[PDB]
Scaffold this active site. Structure first.
Site, PDB file in Angstrom:
ATOM      1  CE1 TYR A  42      -3.615  -2.459   0.198  1.00  0.00           C
ATOM      2  CE2 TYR A  42      -3.689  -2.188   2.599  1.00  0.00           C
ATOM      3  CZ  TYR A  42      -4.179  -2.767   1.436  1.00  0.00           C
ATOM      4  OH  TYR A  42      -5.231  -3.648   1.512  1.00  0.00           O
ATOM      5  CE  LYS A  83      -6.119  -6.855   1.786  1.00  0.00           C
ATOM      6  NZ  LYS A  83      -6.690  -7.220   3.126  1.00  0.00           N
TER       7      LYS A  83
END
Lengths: 252, 254, 252, 252, 252
Positions: free
Chosen positions: C145, C176
C-alpha cells in the site's frame, strides 16, 4: 539477595554515609579542577577519600580502569554525558555491570533524567542495567535528576520528591537526589523513597565551608543516609581538613 | 495454556474483580500521596488490599522487589512514564516478564497509547512481552489508553471502544480502559472486547464517595469484570471503609 | 520449498481465491462493526467464511489466539496500526512467524507502505519476517500500500503497478493491492507481479452490491487470483447471501 | 580468501565485465518496463544476459527466489528503496548474505548514499553485511552514490572520485559508480579506487545508442573493469542487438 | 592486561611516537591526494611510513584489508564519516575489533564528537568497542573531537582539555586531540589526560614547513607522546625528506 542491605554494609557501616563523587571529568569537564590542581589526579582523590575516612568513591570506568586500587569501596558510574551537549537530556551507558565487577566495583551508578524527551531511552537502558545489577549482586545507585519536559525548577520540593519516588519505582537500591534547600520538604522526598536510602547530591561549591555544613545538617535532620559530595570537597585547597569536618558531622 | 482463564481463576474467583492500582508513584508522582500520607507506604497498600478482600495489586518492579510479600496476587506493571514528560506519549518496559515471575507476579501489565506518534514503539515492545507472557504462563493485562495523534476526547465512546478492540487484537488476556460516563456506550466497548475481560480504570478522585459508586454501578451494568482502582481508594482517609463499600457493590452477593 | 505453490494449494484449490479479511478491528477500529453488530464477533466471521465456502480468514494474533478453531485456513496478519495515528505511515509486527505457526496459521501477512518516510522501517522488518516465513515454510502475503512521500492518488495505475512490483521484489509469495478502477490498468499491475498471485483489496463498502460485483469481475478479467474482502461482506446484514454470490462469481 | 579475485574470476573471465542490472523494479518501479514490455519478465532478462554473453545479472531477493535458474552468475542486491520516498536518502537490507548464498548468488550488492543525513545508518548496516560477505566468501559489490547533504551535482568529478574512494575504504571488493561524462576525470575516480575494480553505472536510456557506446569507450580507457547496464539494454526494442554490440566493445 | 603499556611498547619504543594517519580518503575524500598524486596509493603510504622510521599507520578496514602488509604497526580506525554529511556530527563503526585482529592490527581507533546531538550514539557504541578492545587485548585509541552542541571554537584551550579528559574517562588507552596553538594550554590538556598518552592531531597543511615543526615542538614541550600526522607529510611533494625531518625532531 537484598542489595540495599549489601549497599548499607559496604557504604554505611557507621549507619551514615559519605561518598566522594568524581564523575565530574566527563559531566562538567576539567575546568573546575583548576581551583585545586591536584583534583585532576584520581590518585589524589583516592588518598583524599581514604584519609578522610569516607565510605566510597564514584568513578567512570576509564578512571576506575586506570586508577582504582581497591583502597576505598567503588561505585562505578555506568553512564555519562557532557555539558557541551545541547539536546533533550540523555546519558547512555559507556560500560557494563559485568565489567564493573571485574574492576572491583562494590556498586553501580546510573543517571536518569525524568521528564526529558529522551526519558524512555534511559528507562529502557536502566531495565538492562538493573537486571545485570541483580545478576552480579551489585547494588544499583540511581542519580535521579528530573530535567527537560515540564521541569523548570530542579530543586522544587515536588520535583525532588518525584525524583526520589521514581528511583524507588524503577529499582534503585540507593539513590542520589538534589537538596530542596530546607529539611521539611526534603524529608517528604526521603519518606516517599521508602526503604531505599537517599544521598544528597553535593552540587556546586558554596560561598563558604559554613553554608555547606548547614545544608548537610539539614539533609541529616530529614533522615537521609548522607551525602555524595564532589566539588565541595576536592575543589577546596583544604580538602582533607574540610573532609574530616564533613566526617565528624555526618558520622558522630 | 488459556491465560484469560488463569487470570479469571486468580483475580476473579468470585466472578467479578477489584484490583488495587499502585503504579502512581511513577506515572503521576508522590503529590497525590499527601491527602492520606500512609498511601506513600506500599506496606499500607498491601494491608489495605488484603483487609478489603480485593483481588490484586499493581506494582512497578521497584515496589514489587522491595515490598511484595505474596499476601495478595500481584500484577507487575512492566512499563512506566512520568507526567513531567512532554513528547508524543510513550512508555517503555523498565522490567521483564522473567523477572516478574521470580518476584511472584501472577500477571503482567503494559500500557499502550494507540494514536501516539510513538504507537509503533509500544506495539514493537508488546510483541516481545506478549511472547514472554505466553512463555512464562503469565496473563498479559493491557492498559489501553488512546492518546496523541487524532485523539482529542479520551472518554469518547468511539475512542474507548477502539481502545478495547485494540487490546483484544494485540493479545491482551485482560484489559483496563477508561469509562465512557454511561453504561450504554461502555457496554459497546465491553462487547467488542469479546472473550477478553474489561476492568474500568478508576481515575482521579471523585467529589464524593457515592459519585464513584455510581460509576462502578454503571460499569457493572455494562458487563465489565470490575474495576482497577487507585486514588479513589487510597487517596481517601477512610480507605478501608470505602474499599469495603466497593467490595460489597462489586462482589454483590444478592 | 515453493511457497507460492503452497499458498495456491491451500488458499486457491479451485484455481481462484476469496479471503475474508478481518484485521479491521485494529486498522480502523470497531465503528464499522455497528452496521451489522455480529461482525464484532470473530466466531461469526469464522462461521461466515466457512458457510460461504471461502478460502481463508485474516486475523491479528490476538483474535487468532482467542478465537481461531482451525475450521478455515488462517493468514495471521503480523503487523497492525491504527487510524488514530498521524505520523508517516508505519506498521510494525506485534507478533512473529514462529507464534503464527503454533496458532495453526497457513500463511503470514505483512503490510508495507512504499514511499512512506518510514519505508525503511518496514523493509528492515520484512527482511526478518521473510526469512522466518521461509524457515517455517509459511507463505508470506504482502499487503502493498504505497502511502506517504510522493503518493497522492493511491489507486493511480502507476502506483498500483509499483505496489505490485515492490511486493514481488521484496519476496511476497502472494500479494494484496488496491484496484485501479478498471481491468486494463489493473492487468498491468498483475503482469508486473509475474509469478506472484495478486488479490484485490476489497476496500470500503460500495453503494450497491452490484457495484462491488462489477469490480470483482474487472479484477478477474485482469487475471488476478481473486479478492481479499472484508467490510463489503461482513458490514452487510445479508453477509452470507452476498458472500455466496461472490463465491459463484469467483469460483465459477 | 581474496574476494576481489573471486569476483574477477566469476564476473570478468575475459578481463572486462558487463553486468545486466535489474533491481529497477523496486528502485524506480515498473513504468520503464512499458517501452519494451518483455523487460517486466525476469525470465526474459536471464535469456537476454545469457544470449548476449554478459557476465552477470543483479536481482533483488524476491526476483532471485522466484526466477533465478543458475544460468548466469548472480549478484544479489541486498538493499532497495523506492522513488516514492521523500526523506534523506536511505536504503536498508531486505535480505541477507546467508540467504543470497542459498539462492546461488556469486556476489552481494549494497547501495550507500555518502553525505545523506542517514549515511550512518547504511555504514552501520554495511559493517554487518561486509562481515557476512567475508564469512560466506561472497564478494561485496558496493553501489556508491553520494546523495543528500552537501551533494548537489552527483556526476561532478570530485563527487564521483569521493564515491569511489569511500567504497574502497568501506571494504568493497568491486564497486559501481556514476560516470563523470569524460574519461579524464573518470580515470581519477578509477585511480583512487586502487585495487578495487570499478563498473560504470549505466543510467537512464541515452538518446542514440552511439551516445552510450561512447560513454562505454571512455569508461574502458579510463581503466574501469566495465559496465553495469540496465535500461540502456532492456528498455530498447533492439535489446539483443545492442547487448551483442555492447559485448564486442567491452570484451575486445 | 595493561593496554596503554602495550600501546607504548608497540607505537613508542623510542619513548615518543609518530603515527602516519591515512583515514582521510573517507573523512575528507580524495581531493587532497591531488597535490602529491602518489598519496592516493596506500602502498606509497606504507613505504613512506617505513622509510621515515615512523611507528604506525592508521587505515580504515577497506584499505587495511586490500593493502596492509604487516611492515608497519597498524591502528585500524573503526569508524568513519564524510564531509558531505550535514547533520549533527556522528561517525559509526564500519568494522569490528575482531576483524581488526584478524587483519593484523596492533590497536583500534574510534572517533567521538563530545557535544554533538548524537554524542550518546558514539558513547553507546564506544562501550561495545572498548569491551571488545579489552577482550582482544588491542589498545583503544580515541580521536576526541568536541563538535556540535555548544562547541564553537574547537582549538579553545577549555575544549581541547575537555576532549582529553573525556577520552580518559571513557577508557581510551591512548588519545588523539587538536593542538591549542600554544604549549602552556596544551600541557593542561596533557595533564588532565593523566596516565593516558596524548598524540597531537596533525591537521591541514601549514603555510610553511617551519610553522608545522614549531607546533610539533610545542606539543613535545607540553609533554605529549608525539603526533599523528597525515596531510602535513603525504600532501607534500617532498614528503619523505620532511617526514625524515619530523623524525629527527620527535625522537631526538
Amino acid at each position: 539477595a537484598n542489595l540495599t542491605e549489601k549497599f548499607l554494609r559496604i557504604f554505611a557501616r557507621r549507619g551514615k554515609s559519605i561518598i566522594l563523587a568524581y564523575d565530574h571529568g566527563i559531566e562538567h569537564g576539567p575546568a573546575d579542577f583548576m581551583d585545586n590542581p591536584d583534583s585532576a589526579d584520581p590518585e589524589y582523590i583516592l588518598r583524599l577519600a581514604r584519609d578522610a575516612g569516607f565510605d566510597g568513591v564514584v568513578f567512570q570506568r576509564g578512571i576506575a580502569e586506570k586508577y582504582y586500587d581497591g583502597s576505598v569501596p567503588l561505585i562505578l558510574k555506568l553512564n555519562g554525558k557532557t555539558t557541551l551537549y545541547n539536546g533533550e537530556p540523555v546519558s547512555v551507558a559507556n560500560c557494563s555491570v559485568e565489567e564493573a565487577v571485574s574492576l572491583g566495583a562494590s556498586a553501580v551508578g546510573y543517571t536518569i533524567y525524568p521528564g526529558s524527551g529522551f526519558e524512555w531511552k534511559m528507562f529502557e537502558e536502566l531495565a538492562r542495567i538493573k537486571r545485570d545489577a541483580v545478576k552480579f549482586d551489585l547494588p544499583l545507585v540511581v542519580w535521579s535528576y528530573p530535567r527537560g519536559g515540564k521541569v523548570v525548577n530542579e530543586t522544587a520540593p515536588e520535583i525532588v520528591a518525584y525524583a526520589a519516588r521514581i528511583a524507588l519505582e524503577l529499582g534503585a537500591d540507593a539513590m542520589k537526589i538534589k537538596y530542596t534547600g530546607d529539611p521539611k520538604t526534603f524529608s517528604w522526598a526521603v519518606k516517599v523513597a521508602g526503604k531505599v536510602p537517599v544521598l544528597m547530591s553535593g552540587g556546586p561549591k558554596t560561598k563558604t565551608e559554613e553554608d555547606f555544613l548547614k545544608q548537610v545538617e539539614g539533609v541529616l535532620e530529614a533522615g537521609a543516609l548522607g551525602i555524595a559530595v564532589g566539588r565541595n570537597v576536592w575543589q577546596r585547597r583544604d580538602a582533607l581538613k574540610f573532609a574530616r569536618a564533613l566526617a565528624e558531622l555526618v558520622y558522630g
